[PDB]
Enzyme design. Structure first.
Site, PDB file in Angstrom:
ATOM      1  N   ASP A 133      20.333 -23.210  20.260  1.00 45.18           N
ATOM      2  CA  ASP A 133      20.497 -21.755  20.348  1.00 45.18           C
ATOM      3  C   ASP A 133      19.341 -21.065  19.669  1.00 45.18           C
ATOM      4  O   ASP A 133      19.509 -20.088  18.949  1.00 45.18           O
ATOM      5  CB  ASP A 133      21.871 -21.345  19.695  1.00 45.18           C
ATOM      6  CG  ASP A 133      22.251 -19.861  19.986  1.00 45.18           C
ATOM      7  OD1 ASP A 133      21.700 -19.253  20.903  1.00 45.18           O
ATOM      8  OD2 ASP A 133      23.122 -19.333  19.240  1.00 45.18           O
ATOM      9  N   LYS A 135      16.339 -18.641  18.934  1.00 43.15           N
ATOM     10  CA  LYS A 135      16.079 -17.233  19.318  1.00 43.15           C
ATOM     11  C   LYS A 135      15.488 -16.444  18.148  1.00 43.15           C
ATOM     12  O   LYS A 135      15.595 -16.888  17.000  1.00 43.15           O
ATOM     13  CB  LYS A 135      17.429 -16.531  19.828  1.00 43.15           C
ATOM     14  CG  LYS A 135      18.490 -16.557  18.751  1.00 43.15           C
ATOM     15  CD  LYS A 135      19.945 -16.171  19.328  1.00 43.15           C
ATOM     16  CE  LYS A 135      21.008 -16.469  18.271  1.00 43.15           C
ATOM     17  NZ  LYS A 135      22.433 -16.391  18.785  1.00 43.15           N
ATOM     18  N   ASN A 138      17.458 -16.046  14.811  1.00 40.72           N
ATOM     19  CA  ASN A 138      17.635 -17.060  13.815  1.00 40.72           C
ATOM     20  C   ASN A 138      16.328 -17.729  13.419  1.00 40.72           C
ATOM     21  O   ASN A 138      16.359 -18.801  12.789  1.00 40.72           O
ATOM     22  CB  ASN A 138      18.741 -18.090  14.149  1.00 40.72           C
ATOM     23  CG  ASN A 138      18.539 -18.774  15.549  1.00 40.72           C
ATOM     24  OD1 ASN A 138      17.425 -18.877  15.997  1.00 40.72           O
ATOM     25  ND2 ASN A 138      19.614 -19.187  16.216  1.00 40.72           N
ATOM     26  N   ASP A 151      20.751 -21.443  11.384  1.00 41.61           N
ATOM     27  CA  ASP A 151      21.861 -21.309  12.338  1.00 41.61           C
ATOM     28  C   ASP A 151      22.044 -22.604  13.102  1.00 41.61           C
ATOM     29  O   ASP A 151      21.765 -22.683  14.298  1.00 41.61           O
ATOM     30  CB  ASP A 151      21.545 -20.101  13.246  1.00 41.61           C
ATOM     31  CG  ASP A 151      22.695 -19.753  14.268  1.00 41.61           C
ATOM     32  OD1 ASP A 151      23.848 -20.218  14.166  1.00 41.61           O
ATOM     33  OD2 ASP A 151      22.341 -19.093  15.255  1.00 41.61           O
ATOM     34  N   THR A 164      22.829 -18.009  23.353  1.00 44.36           N
ATOM     35  CA  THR A 164      22.608 -16.657  23.715  1.00 44.36           C
ATOM     36  C   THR A 164      21.972 -16.549  25.129  1.00 44.36           C
ATOM     37  O   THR A 164      20.989 -17.257  25.454  1.00 44.36           O
ATOM     38  CB  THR A 164      21.696 -16.082  22.663  1.00 44.36           C
ATOM     39  OG1 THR A 164      22.372 -16.270  21.411  1.00 44.36           O
ATOM     40  CG2 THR A 164      21.419 -14.662  22.903  1.00 44.36           C
TER      41      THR A 164
END
Ligand SMILES: CC(C)n1cc(C(=O)c2cncc(N[C@@H]3COC[C@@H]3c3ccc(F)cc3)n2)c2c(N)ncnc21
Length: 278
Positions: A133, A135, A138, A151, A164
């Site tokens: 995840d 992005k 994070n 994260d 996401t």
């Protein structure tokens, strides 16, 4: 081992942010004056929502990482109700903040932060860990403006979860499987977002974003740094075995050798002075 810490060892301060299952609060340890970002998770809510595997994985993944481009997990403790994870306090917040603040990065800034991200992914993948995840929200920035990636409760450790929507790789939508090359897809989106100021697949709802991803439906703006465009094109590839950096493409060597990164010195990036944004 130092004795287990407990909530009375800290003066808790401002909330740094709030998520679905946890809250991150600034805390000062009384015995040392050190500041930590303490992630606090309520045990009843985690149990009720079947999140024990994700919270256990977050702790197990973070405790394995020992590299400067990752948030460090210093300690854990719990009381009757809550779990506490003592993390590095990344004082400059999310990369996403700088992208919004500055608009978009010039080529020097894009290349330097992209190189840090690639270097962190190389380290993570070398331990057989997929983030899943990744992005700009994070990828945090420390007080020296180096990255610290965080994260990890959604990470996969190599021998179900969709990230996401903007950064989701087509293999997750087309056969629900994740691999190292899924993080390289998110890397392509992030590089695009640094240069363009916006992520490449955008739409009014998730279903529409998912439809553009599986069609490879995005465009480059006219301005886009040509060597960065060439790199993004070799990362946003539908076939996950053909992304620069993946094992079937012979790994991180050929990615680090891409012409976009020609002036990068890879060996000691965290000791380099980051270029000023903007
Ligand atoms: C920027 C601030 C909020 N912040 C976060 C830090 C974390 O480590 C962390 C850990 N787990 C996830 C996570 N981010 C997740 C990605 O999107 C939202 C989601 C989320 C989830 C829960 C939540 F409570 C806040 C944000 N961040 C951090 C730090 N270590 N030091 C200085 N500031 C920090």
């Amino acid at each position: 081992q130092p004795r287990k810490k407990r909530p009375e060892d800290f003066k808790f301060g401002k909330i740094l942010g709030e998520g679905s299952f946890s809250t991150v609060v600034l805390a000062r340890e009384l015995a040392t004056s050190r500041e930590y970002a303490i992630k606090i998770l309520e045990k009843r809510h985690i149990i009720k929502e079947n999140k024990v595997p994700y919270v256990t994985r977050e702790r197990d993944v973070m405790s394995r990482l020992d590299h400067p481009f990752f948030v460090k997990l210093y300690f854990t403790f719990q009381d009757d109700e809550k779990l506490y994870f003592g993390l590095s306090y990344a004082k400059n917040g999310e990369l996403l903040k700088y992208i919004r603040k500055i608009g978009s990065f010039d080529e020097t800034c894009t290349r330097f932060y992209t190189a840090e991200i690639v270097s962190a992914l190389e380290y993570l993948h070398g331990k057989g860990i997929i983030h899943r995840d990744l992005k700009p929200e994070n990828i945090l920035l420390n007080e020296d403006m180096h990255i610290q990636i965080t994260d990890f409760g959604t990470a996969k450790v190599l021998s179900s979860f969709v990230g996401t929507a903007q950064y989701v790789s087509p293999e997750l939508l087309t056969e629900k499987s994740a691999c190292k090359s899924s993080d390289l897809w998110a890397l392509g989106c992030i590089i695009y977002q640094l240069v363009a100021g916006l992520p490449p697949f955008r739409a009014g709802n998730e279903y529409l974003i998912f439809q553009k991803i599986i069609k490879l439906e995005y465009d480059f703006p006219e301005k886009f740094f040509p060597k960065a465009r060439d790199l993004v094109e070799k990362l946003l590839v539908l076939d996950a075995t053909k992304r620069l950096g993946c094992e079937e493409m012979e790994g991180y060597g050929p990615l680090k050798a891409h012409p976009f990164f020609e002036s990068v010195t890879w060996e000691n990036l965290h000791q380099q002075t980051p270029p000023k944004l903007t």
